[PDB]
Amino acid sequence: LFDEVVGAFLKGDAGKYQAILSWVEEQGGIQVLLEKLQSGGLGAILSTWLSNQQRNQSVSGEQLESALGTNAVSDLGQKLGVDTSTASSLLAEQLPKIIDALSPQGEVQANNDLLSAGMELLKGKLF
């Protein structure tokens, strides 16, 4: 336990982005998550993230755990070594920024290989 606790203290939130990326793909891709947000009543909030004119509407960790499901969120928590609530809070901060970044044309290739879609977007800013 000692080395486990010391490691977690020293690491902080390092590697959160790799974890989220891997988790998105393990859950079946960004499109699965989009559909869950939509079926879970967060379609209007999601529409503000997709828009290329509007500011992202805030969402709570609880709202995301509700829409995405406890198992899905716990899957990310497990990858990070943290509890489900900490994982939902991480997603509440980062997921809107991720979805916004993936939709410069107002919709979200992101679904087939996320890292590849991300690399194209990064390179677009360098082009």
Q: Which is nearer to Na ion, 62 or 83 (CB)?
A: 83
| Residue 77 CB, nearest approach to Na ion (Å) | 8
Q: Which of 29, 40, 51, 75 binds Na ion (CB under 5 A)?
A: 75
| Residue 78 CB, nearest approach to Na ion (Å) | 6
| Residue 71 CB, nearest approach to Na ion (Å) | 5
Q: By beta-carbon distance, which residue lies closest to Na ion? A: 74
Q: Does 74 engage in binding with Na ion (CB under 5 A)?
A: yes
| Residue 88 CB, nearest approach to Na ion (Å) | 13
Q: Does 22 engage in binding with Na ion (CB under 5 A)?
A: no
Site for Na ion in 32-71 (CB under 5 A): 71
Q: Which is nearer to Na ion, 48 or 78 (CB)?
A: 78
User: SS3 sequence, the chain?
Assistant: CHHHHHHHHHHCCCCHHHHHHHHHHHCCCHHHHHHHHHHCCCHHHHHHHHCCCCCCCCCCHHHHHHHHCHHHHHHHHHHHCCCHHHHHHHHHHHHHHHHHHCCCCCCCCCCCCHHHHHHHHHHHHHC
For 106, residues 6+ apart whose C-beta sits below 8 A from its C-beta are 50, 51, 52
